[PDB]
């Protein structure tokens, strides 16, 4: 795995998808915008499109929202975005073997560059144990507080500059990776 | 209704010095910053050796420490000291497990340990009562939130997109709720978005 | 003139207790942080079913809320409280689509709404005054700017560069403003360079 | 055959700095940024340059040709001048609201060409202002910000509202220097609602 | 018999506010500061007297009154004018640079006095620009900062050196407003080095 | 002392002094600065002068660095500016009282309001002590360290906003009591 | 000198990927923002139950955590991992107690403790040589500071008119110190004025 | 042209080590954050008693400090290290009161200060450039000021009303004019409104 943490990334991957329009994927806000720039400079606009892991989860969401209303799942990972990677939730996952090839189609016709989109079912406790172990990483301590459609992790003590920046970090990690559909965070007031 | 006015009023004197059993004066300060500044008086006329100065969170720390000590189950709330000499101590209803000869010895185990006070009046308050207020205080303040119930007591998780106005009104409230009920039963916490 | 002399150098009373209609004790603050404060008294005496504490912002957003219910399509300003007995309802004379009959009438449910009013003196506002004393203000501060008309009303997009104390003096202002006449004529916007 | 084009327009190995010589017989260097321009500048000082050589930004030279404008054009309804080629410079102006004609329309990029004695040409291109209020829109939207449109004498104007959380202000911050960069401030304005 | 006279000046028993009527039969509210300005100003128009009555404090009235004098004396050496008493504001010029004569200056005073409808009359006194100077260095020692003085064209320069504290900082701030509010700042200016 | 606690002070006090000039007495920065505009206002200036605690002191060590550069002392307070009180280290303290009669004396030529000035000898002790005590009851951990001319307390622990500004307050409480001339404070840095 | 190049380059790959005696994969980021995206690589693709994420910082907790238990008087520094799989110990020479063989038995369960490590070196440090370099630093920075010696070790009070640019420099320096020396020995504190 | 092109094109190396003719071998750094991280670097490999870290600003402090005393009426801005084997030395020709015999002197002794510098090359700087350069940045950038002579140079203080922005673009001009002249000749002020 040397390999695939010293890989290289291009910055800006141009990728013609299904409706004849080409996507460019970006890693980050500000590329999005900068190339969402170029594209408006070149008159480009009515050929390509800019996209990113964040812009993209949301439209899906928003989707998901009407047609999916019941659906537990996390995030969807762009790191190959050909093959994006849909992640679900299994405990709550109440779909036979069929369906789950329907959904997939369904969010191939949403990416008109996904080639297909792999669906994986996540553990529940995976996720939740993972926001555990990361809280004892960065030394933060916390209380754990289960409820309907999720957990909370209250991170509590006093907490400094730094204590509350390295905390602010890793929250962030650990939503590129889990969304806070299932785990949100959140800090004490004393 | 009259009582109100009174209650509510620019009426009382700034610090108010109280005659302790163990022959040392206590100054209630209402206030850190006025406690503070009584500091400052008293090392300056060198009464330092004599007097000392008070306030409700300074005591409260003080009330809490010992209590650890002897009895450690306790479920409790806060000492008001609107009337200094006459501490008034919140309870638990529901939690409360003593009987009521057991509460007078409380009371005056506490009315040793401020030498100051005449007595120290026990409230059991309603737990229900305590967390309603929490909820109604924050929809009074049109902060949404999500009541999470757990083995301690209540965590209200403050929700929503965050303003930097409504964050400050949003601590201001819960410094007030602190004040009257302190951070033993109901906590709140921001969310992180 | 002294009419004036004295209304600007009264010793408005911090709070006021009022009882209402509804038997309940009314306390009246001035600001959010007296409202808090009252709203602890009330709680560490009992009061809490008794008395409630209200204030200007508060009512405003309470009856606000009634209103877009059951006036949905009600063209109106804000309510002044300086004597909450008869709290002051400005309407827009320009947008008024109502008999006296019919006014008196709404007078009457927002009477019911507040316990503590005796009765609602509603009040016809001219558009024009409205608008003209955003565009004074604005001068008086020297704060250039740019009117853009809409559905709803007026747009004020204060423009120009803007110190750190362009930026303040202009959120005081608007604050002066907002109290008087409320945000849902004028609206005031900071341009981005 | 553009694909190829998008790929070679968002290559990263164009040069950081790139020098034109002028009909003035100075050297311009084409800096893509105000830092890179204080390097440059601060390069030049101290090899004494300073003398024959001037640096260039896009933000720079649309404020010289704006202050042009205002005496030689002053009712010219146009946008921003690009430099993504600093040889050949593109100069956005309204079709719905160019009075000129096409031979005036190349007056006024011979008078360019002459202000600005690096370049080859200078590309004039027609734009739809039903574009400009457009983009201003979609990108408003595809960046989760509520706003109301305000029509009026010299464009448009974009309320931004909501209650607004303080990455959400950097947000909207950082989106409009983005759309000023393309299209400029003449014609859509953006404000935040003060509530 | 002063010190009496320092008494009362620095007594608090002093109303907020001052109605007083004008020759254009409006009437000032003179206001001590913006806050209670921006008060009055709020309880006017609540009252529905804001035909009749006006708010005025000597930061605004400062700025009017220059405005007026930038047509009618564009060449005045002056300070600021003062309204600790609104019905009798003091208006400091300089001495070694007023060029006007005796009847000269009580036409000033007529045509001040006409300006501000709400004044019984307009007193001038000349100031001497060292006193000014040297009164800014002064408070400059007292406030415990390392300063260059600087002479130039309209008066004298502080540039205020030293690596600053951030409550060194805040410290020179304050006085600076103090030194304005009094002597304003057409002939002294302070500055803050950067190093 | 009831008395002496909610005593109320006039804002500020007219003292002629030995010296015909009129001293006047404010109680901070803020209200020297204005009193020092109206007596600029109304030409005073030539005939009064604005005094504060903070600003007395400065003065008079300035003296005191050039005539008595050994002297070992706290500060001057200013409570009763008819006869200010000046609190010198007991421990360090190598003078007759013959010679403290002389310093008095010498420092009551430096102030004309004053009517006599005060010398009062203290404890070492007693202000370091102070300084712990109240350390503890603003409940802010810390080492104590002795040295050559005083004693240092490195306040140590994380330290939050609020726990920050706590022991910011507290510095500045001890030091217009003690001055920063025996015991100095500082945050450890972690 | 050829040897300073290599030191000092920009040769180094990102990640270094060590296999570990316990069959788990050490990743060894270099800092605490590349330990977060290493972290998040594994847990998409997967590797987090057969790799984990390492850096200096916390190795260094780790080791000091443990050595409070088996080791709890040792007088040392830091624990540096400019080669992982080498990393260098450093403890105080004058303050050592230990045999030569002693030392070595160390070097070995610190072997044990780090599943990864090829070797664990040792190396007295010289307890002048740390405050030296801390004193030659401050100088280096024209940063006044008074030093303390006290029991523990030794702080370096900073002071003076501290400047909002000096205040990040001192921080910057002294974060600098502490990576390579640590915080056990020499402490830094700033002066309140 | 060319020569241009290059120059502005370079990759500047990172780190150069320099063997001085006092044997010690030192590592040229870009800026203070680079210095420390080799600092670092030597100290975890012992090379501390063989090489050093030099800087351009660092640089420029030490050897003003030796000129303070042995030159302290002589009128220069700054020191360039582009080149640190060579690094020329800008005085000034309109205060110069040396014959071309005294300068080489200076030059040599310059010299001996720095062990990796194998000539320092004196070159005599036109103080209406100095002043001229302020002047013509201060309007790239847009920024209002007027210029004050003294004794010493010139302070420009800056004027106008300012942004967060116009002070920072002013904040960042600044840096760049002291990072080619100094601040010994040319001064710079922002006004206070």
Redesign the interface.
Known sequence: ??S???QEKE??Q?L?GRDKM?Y?AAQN??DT??????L???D??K??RVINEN?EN?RISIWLDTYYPQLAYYRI?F?EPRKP?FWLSRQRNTMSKKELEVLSQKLRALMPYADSVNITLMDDVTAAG?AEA?LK?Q?LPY?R?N?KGGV?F?IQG????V?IL?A????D?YY??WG?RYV???????
Chains 1, 6 share one sequence.
Request: charged share 30%; hydrophobic share 40%.
């Open positions: 795995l040397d695939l943490l010293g910055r800006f141009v013609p080409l460019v806000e500000r915008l900068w190339a969402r720039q170029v408006a400079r070149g480009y606009d050929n390509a812009e949301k990972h790191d990677v993972q990361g990483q030394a209380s507080r409820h909370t209250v006093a907490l400094d500059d204590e390295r602010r970090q890793f929250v990690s590129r990776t806070g949100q965070f959140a800090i004490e007031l004393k």
